[PDB]
Amino acid sequence: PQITLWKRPLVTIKIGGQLKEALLDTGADDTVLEEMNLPGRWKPKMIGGIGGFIKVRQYDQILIEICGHKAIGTVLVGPTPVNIIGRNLLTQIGCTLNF
């Protein structure tokens, strides 16, 4: 679809069998989700934005469905204020910016 930017570009995602709301974020290299208990091994990581860094758990090869479009990649999980879909998964669903 086409998403305008008058409001935060929030969409429904399906991950680990659960539905969540997430922000499509072209300014994010990586995808960061609010605290959730995903199964499997993970690696510690630190992610930075405005204000500093937070500690996250990095999970590899996680499947996420974003408005019916499937993507598979690295998902970071930690105390983020909002679920963020980053470029690593937005490239996979064929997302572009247009103006």
Q: Which residues bind ligand OO4 (CB under 6 A)?
A: 25, 27-30, 32, 47-50, 81-82, 84, 86
Exactly one of 25, 29, 30, 60 is catalytic; name it: 25
Alpha helix locations (H) across 15-80?
A: none
Asked whether 47 and 33 are in contact (CB, 8 A), the reply is no
Q: Name the helix (H) or strand (E) containing 93.
A: none
25 annotated active-site: yes
Taking residue 16's Cβ as centre, other Cβ atoms within 10 Å add up to 16
Does 44 help bind its own copies (rule: CB under 8 A)?
no
Asked whether 29 and 36 are in contact (CB, 8 A), the reply is no
1, 17, 40, 44: which one contacts its own copies (CB under 8 A)? Answer: 1
Binding to its own copies by CB under 8 A, coded x per residue (else -) over 3-42, reads xxxx-xx-------------xxxxxxx--x----------
Nearer to its own copies, 12 or 26 (CB): 26
Taking residue 73's Cβ as centre, other Cβ atoms within 10 Å add up to 17
- Return the active site residues: 25
